[PDB]
Amino acid sequence: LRVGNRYRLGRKIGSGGDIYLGTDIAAGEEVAIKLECVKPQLHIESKIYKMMQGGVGIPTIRWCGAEGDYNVMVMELLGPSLEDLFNFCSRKFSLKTVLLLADQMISRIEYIHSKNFIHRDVKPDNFLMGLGKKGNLVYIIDFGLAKKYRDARTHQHIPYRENKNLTGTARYASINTHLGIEQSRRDDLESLGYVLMYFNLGSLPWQGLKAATKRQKYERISEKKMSTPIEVLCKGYPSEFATYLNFCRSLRFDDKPDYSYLRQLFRNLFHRQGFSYDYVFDWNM
Ligand SMILES: COc1ccc(-c2cc(C(=O)Nc3cc(-c4c(-c5ccc(F)cc5)noc4C(C)C)ccn3)n3c2CN2C[C@H](O)[C@H](O)[C@H]2C3)cc1
Numbered sequence: 065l066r067v068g069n070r071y072r073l074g075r076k077i078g079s080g081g082d083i084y085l086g087t088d089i090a091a092g093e094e095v096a097i098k099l100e101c102v103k104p105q106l107h108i109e110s111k112i113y114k115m116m117q118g119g120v121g122i123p124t125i126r127w128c129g130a131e132g133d134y135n136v137m138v139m140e141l142l143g144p145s146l147e148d149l150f151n152f153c154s155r156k157f158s159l160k161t162v163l164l165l166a167d168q169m170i171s172r173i174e175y176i177h178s179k180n181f182i183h184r185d186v187k188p189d190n191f192l193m194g195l196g197k198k199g200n201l202v203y204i205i206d207f208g209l210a211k212k213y214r215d216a217r218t219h220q221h222i223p224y225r226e227n228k229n230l231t232g233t234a235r236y237a238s239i240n241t242h243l244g245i246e247q248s249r250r251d252d253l254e255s256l257g258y259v260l261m262y263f264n265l266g267s268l269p270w271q272g273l274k275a276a277t278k279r280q281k282y283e284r285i286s287e288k289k290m291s292t293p294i295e296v297l298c299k300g301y302p303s304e305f306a307t308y309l310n311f312c313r314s315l316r317f318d319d320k321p322d323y324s325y326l327r328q329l330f331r332n333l334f335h336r337q338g339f340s341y342d343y344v345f346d347w348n349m
Pocket of ligand 1: 077078079080083096097098137138139140141142143144145148189192195205
């Protein structure tokens with residue numbers, strides 16, 4: 065079974081809505097292939113990927129097209145997601161690994177923002193480690209929910225609006241996203257703050273809530289998230305994680321985040337440990 069007369073389809077390797085391992089027959093290396101039934105967001109997403117190409121940690125798209133009952137996108141092969149690796153590490157990351165990940169993840173989000181888009185679904189499942197020579201590089205994937213937030217030429221910001229439906233993953237959504245406020249740059253970074261504390265804790269305190277329908281469940285998540293102060297969420301971990309989250313929640317809708325300040329919070333903590341720290345992630349030790 066071939067895709068584009070040139071890619072051999074292999075076994076399924078995930079879903080993000082089905083991801084297959086593939087082989088570039090001509091070049092002889094493996095690839096990742098995403099197939100979508102013609103119902104649609106793959107072609108729109110491919111254009112965003114191609115707008116982002118060249119950035120550090122942005123995957124390369126090898127081919128786009130249609131094959132029978134599927135729209136197809138072929139991407140360079142990447143490794144397991146950070147969720148996969150978190151589970152492999154028994155849902156415990158060392159502080160070193162969390163700080164190493166935080167530095168790269170802030171930079172990936174900054175790059176997307178520099179290209180005039182907001183990601184709007186920041187979660188561990190959308191960060192993948194490279195393979196082989198790129199095993200120390202964090203990649204970001206999935207622009208199916210991404211949105212342009214400013215004009216490319218003038219940088220004029222999209223307007224503030226409310227009554228927006230939740231586009232993303234409830235567990236990691238910002239408070240203002242739960243309130244139905246238009247997402248902006250601050251919300252990508254606030255979601256990352258929850259991801260980092262997720263890595264620190266093994267789970268977040270608004271996980272595991274049940275309800276009749278999705279809407280009621282999101283309301284339960286919203287209530288618990290709003291009633292858990294950052295100081296309680298982050299107790300027992302270096303204060304930098306609370307400082308990060310408080311900074312993100314204090315950003316105005318239109319504010320350009322101080323990415324450098326946020327990276328330096330964690331970089332200073334990392335460097336203060338001196339030689340007691342490596343540049344080796346837990347799963348490579
Ligand atoms: C021999 O050594 C090896 C070999 C392979 C691996 C290897 C490679 C992968 C993998 O998923 N790669 C991958 C996935 C995507 C991808 C896409 C996507 C694909 C194409 C496209 F155009 C746009 C998006 N959308 O979503 C995903 C993720 C979330 C699934 C993109 C690029 N790369 N996984 C493994 C290892 N596995 C362990 C566990 O079982 C995981 O589930 C599975 C994941 C590790 C070691």
